[model samples]
Target: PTEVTLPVEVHDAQFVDFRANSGTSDVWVQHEGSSAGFGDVGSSGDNAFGDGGSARVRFKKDVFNHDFSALPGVSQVVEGLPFNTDVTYSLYYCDNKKDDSLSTLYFGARDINGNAITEEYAHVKDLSNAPQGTNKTCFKKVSTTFNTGNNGSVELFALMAIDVNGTMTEEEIYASSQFTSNELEVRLDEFSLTYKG
Candidate 1:
């Protein structure tokens, strides 16, 4: 389906307490806006929820124009989550990446102590289809569901990992390198995480 279609049971799940681009509470787990060779990460009014605002990631011009490898994206850490339950993470994205950029909209989770959960990442292909944006863009709804087993907190994150040259090693693709010069823009809206207890 083109739109975000949740499972019948997840429709009534309780949302996890966290800010989904509410205001100035957005924080990055890796690079920041002031970081060198990277773009900004903050709330944007371009295509936000009810046009209020949404979190966005901008890449430097030509950053991904050539051979590249990095997991440049955003992260949100939530605490006091329930254990042994199904968690659903959902968000809307508007991107201007080329159809064949070999980029993936990566989503995953980390343990309370900073360990990457092997069962959490949904390494999906880059956003290329969905509803139309305001102008010169399109929106895609990406979502993933996984069980949080015996853990009470996690660092849930979404990142853009690219293998432009089709030669990126596994480590490089998953590495935290916010290096980009592509001048591409990726806007995320209506971000939410819910758990079915």
Candidate 2:
């Protein structure tokens, strides 16, 4: 019998203490041209890691999807991701839109050392990069699991994109003024990343 080192898989991961970053913190900001980010509040607002009070990223409830397709939507970068391992990233969402349009939402990852990121398994709603979720407040969990795979570092993203008039891959709906109507709003909070060894 060949007695070799059978590496036992361990449970290792990293989670964010959202309060660590503020409206002033540079790592936390709305990426590119997408208008989205977060702010902490007291007892009268949306909670992040459950109960009483927490920070809230007031995201516009609309299709960040696009026609050119494979687009990168509204995002808030998170640094120091676990290197070379399988990670499961998840967050809670709250909105009033009672449709799987949540499926219209999508997310993925990338490495700073120039390593490639992949959409291992995401909630695809419209067949090609469109994913919707539940129709109740605080009742949806959007998640994705993937490996950095290479000997490199990584980061997290709240991925989505919109390009109305480009019909390259899929018929992507263009960006509309979701911040209007004095209604339609979404929230992003409780960001967690787990390293599955």
Candidate with maximal TM-score: 1
Candidate 2 lDDT by residue in tens digits, 1-197: 65332221211111133333332333443442223222112111455444322233223334332222333323344444556666666655444443333323445666665344755323323233223233224524667767656534454555433222334333222233333331123444445566643
Clash pairs for candidate 1: 60-181, 60-183, 61-181, 62-181, 62-182, 63-180, 63-181, 63-182
Total backbone collisions, model 2: 14
* Cα-based lDDT at residue 189, candidate 1: 58
Please write out the lDDT profile of model 1 over residues 59-162, one tens digit for every residue: 55433332234455667676665677777766666654556444556676778787776333222244444544453245566677777797666776767655
For candidate 2, the TM-score is 0.51
Return the TM-score for candidate 1, rounded to 2 decimals.
0.62
- Best-matching candidate per lDDT: 1
Clash count, one per candidate? 8, 14
The local distance difference test score of model 1 is: 0.52
